[PDB]
Symmetry: D2
Subunit: 295 residues, 4 copies
């Protein structure tokens, strides 16, 4: 037997950082969950019980806190690139670092119409994520994403004209509820190293904001022919607005809301144009994915 692939590290490292403006008194908080996995010349820890090649996962944890102390933690694309670069530069035998960051929302509270200097609310479980792969000699690959963005529209969604055969019971419809949890990922062109990532720092927050805005606007305004058609429109627009993105991937559940026929009860009308009360279905769910790139 032989080791074909190996990676190891520390997962679920929760980190909070506060920034204090001494001039204005305003405080800003950041909270993330971080995972770092390393690869390199470490096969002997597996095959020969040679621990001398192991940077202890406990030390990886320490390094995450130290790096957060000494560097900005925002945008997460930059922090992830700093953290990954550290490992490949510090340890001769480590040749790749894989950094995953989930950013949790702490939104400044408005109290009596004004922004509070040091009080925050978690408005939704929507996350902003990054995956950063730093590979010695091959630069830095960054995938940015938003996830956990849950939306619903109560009309202006259709689904008709699909394949009908002996396995089909679904009725065609010209008016249905459409609800999904949005997972959208944009993959940046490969960067040569940290200097190049630093040069593009302003683009990271701007592209996240654009991706979010395009997602919400397109969902709200499209008279949707299907999840497939609406999601493609989203992806097309993001690629048009940021030339440094190579691909956009969406993964969308179709969270079904079923009509409830109540006609057995005193002829009550609750279907088609008369439908008011629906039964949300926990499962099963449609799952629709697409990756869109440039011509």
């Amino acid at each position: 037997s032989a080791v074909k692939a190996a990676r190891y590290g520390k997962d679920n490292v929760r980190v909070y950082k506060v920034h204090k403006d001494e001039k204005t008194g305003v405080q800003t908080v950041y909270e993330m969950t971080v995972c770092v996995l390393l690869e390199g010349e470490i096969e002997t820890s597996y095959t020969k019980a040679d621990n001398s090649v192991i940077v202890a996962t406990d030390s990886i944890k320490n390094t995450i806190y130290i790096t957060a102390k000494q560097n900005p933690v925002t945008p997460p694309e930059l922090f992830g690139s700093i953290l990954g670069t550290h490992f490949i530069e510090k340890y001769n035998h480590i040749h790749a670092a894989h950094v995953n960051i989930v950013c949790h929302r702490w939104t400044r509270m408005d109290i009596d119409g004004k922004p509070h200097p040091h009080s925050f609310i978690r408005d939704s479980e929507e996350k902003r994520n990054v995956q950063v792969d730093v590979v010695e000699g091959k630069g830095i690959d960054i995938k940015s994403s938003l996830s956990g963005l849950t939306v619903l529209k109560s009309t202006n969604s259709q689904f008709w004209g699909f394949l009908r055969d002996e396995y089909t019971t679904l009725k065609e419809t010209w008016d249905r509820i459409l609800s999904t949890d949005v997972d959208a990922t944009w993959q940046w062109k490969n960067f040569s190293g940290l200097q190049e990532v630093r040069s593009h720092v302003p683009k990271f927050d701007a592209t996240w904001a654009t991706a979010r805005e395009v997602t919400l606007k397109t969902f709200a305004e499209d008279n949707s022919a299907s999840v497939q058609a609406t999601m493609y429109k989203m992806a097309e627009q993001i690629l048009a607005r940021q030339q440094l993105i190579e691909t956009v991937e969406y993964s969308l559940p179709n969270k079904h809301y079923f009509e409830i026929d109540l006609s057995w009860h005193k002829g009550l009308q609750n279907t088609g144009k008369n439908a008011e009360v629906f039964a949300p279905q926990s499962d099963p769910n449609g799952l629709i994915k697409c990756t869109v790139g440039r011509s």
Copy 2:
């Protein structure tokens, strides 16, 4: 042996309702999870296999949908009171109905600065809940609550002057992070029946909004001496603003964020006044409760 207490019904009934304004084209959605448990002269179903006394839980489910079709579902205090009253009036041998409703957030989207007519976003997992107990001959008892409201302040929290003995290691502090998930419940005076609940309908949404506002403002503005002291201030204010409330209960976890001593690493300073990076603790957590009533 004897049956001392019994209740049975249907839990986890998901319900969505849409309201369509034909004039303006504006649609409004409501989504809830409902549980109804019944009590009454049903002991023989347990002791004698006498199913003739059982309103099937499946029928309870049907009734929830029918009631939602025929009545307003908002405010939830009213819907719960209608639903509970139905069971005690329809079935001679059922003498109490217990209705729990969890309301999920569907917040209208703003697209380009204007409210969208039919598109919604789940902004946070904060819930608005009601528990309604309808008891034949004893009226309607309603407890309203908000839950899952997660907040953090990065300064203006203290904790010193507590009991110190041989079990104590905690250091006194004059500046710490305070973070909690708020669970707040207000209990209404007993109502004589549905007519009286209907008479107070406008107070329900208003009191929910007040409870939320008082909670957020007090948390943000109090230079907190402890969770105990800050929570009491919240409860006192809610009781002062709504005379039809008899008690207010808060249940608050104290979600700890620990300082990380980094001084072992090149003398890095990250404690006390120099603390910037902290480790959020998943567990254990403080749990602080209080019920506040009138003199």
Copy 3:
């Protein structure tokens, strides 16, 4: 305003203890999650910011570890009683302690037919729990429970003869699937104090084992007329076997498995006597409760 009720303490305290037999080399592990909430003369911490009455929740955490170091942690009824008694005896102004313990399964592994001395497996998420309320001058009240015991029988369950009216669509049946998650609680007679709890130590594990055995056997063997009827039979038997139990409470979801009509597809027969493939329903679910006591 006035404080009507208050309690505070530490939740989610995870504890592991190992016992090492130096003679045989055999090790035995215990793992629990513990919550302790205190009550007493503590109103001033809420109303006057008087922290001098507060035993810090951090100190409560320390006390749990110290108590586990110095005492047996099994049976959990005994450990909970020791822990609760500690607080009311040590602190003059604390008059009640409420201790909740969840015990997690670590079952010794069998390797090649023999019990391994120090290796364990988590066989199921079934828990054994206790709630211990220690109240100064009123003794010790203990509720013991098992929870998370998930079972299914594929036949020998019926449900017919229930009330039928204009809200009813459910068909009567003489053969259905019955599946539930069992939550069963037995409440002990009040104990005068720790000496009395110690005197009954052997009964705690024995009664847990009996409750479990009676639950499983009755479920498997009863040709069930309803959940109500089968659960009553369980409760009756437990009360008959342990005279020191005052009441038994069961709370049982009815986890539905629906027939799937496939007759639209080439006349395929999959209902009634021909039913082979079913659709488990995540929600809604029946919820059936009963508390059984002595004549």
Copy 4:
């Protein structure tokens, strides 16, 4: 813009099947959660709103139930291969099917020492899974796995000799607790089609049982030098026992249990050789992966 990749289908389809032996009266149940995603010539549904190429996800759901009615559902490697093959053969424009199956445990109850004919218990949340990729012209690729197998050993684990630098605080140890949740995957050699999968049917259950047995025995018996070293020993043995496996992958969290220094309290000794009470850590956790193949 262009579609680079697309797949769509139905997730979270819960399925139960019962087998009834008319001779013996013995019933056997199977319960699974199934996901099927399709690929093929479907780009126009995304780019042109051409729904004519879409096999509706609702129809995919129907097909899963029909296929389960007409075929054995065990071993899951066979069921997955039948289900995937169906889609690529039935639809000219569908060229790949991806089938994921999670099998839930329903273990026959022993009542009074004998196996019950129709009563079952969920003993643990351990799962047996398969991923089956059926690609037109390239055969059938199957990955089998077990997951959610949670184990702990209280001694005979060591970790010393790792890299020490200015980021390291971890102490070397010759005796620690080792606990993990096992995720193990074995990848079969590519099969040419369904006939070949059918020819190997007996190997599927046997290899699952072997993988499980080797995992448990190795964990219990190895005086572990590290997670890395112990996991490699497991993988090596599985590859030696089943020649039709090409690779074995393990992904193992290192779930930490920390010593608690109690010496501040009356000199209580609870570290090193005196350690009895430990604090399980929910997070962070080590994460160790390896893929082992043939020379």
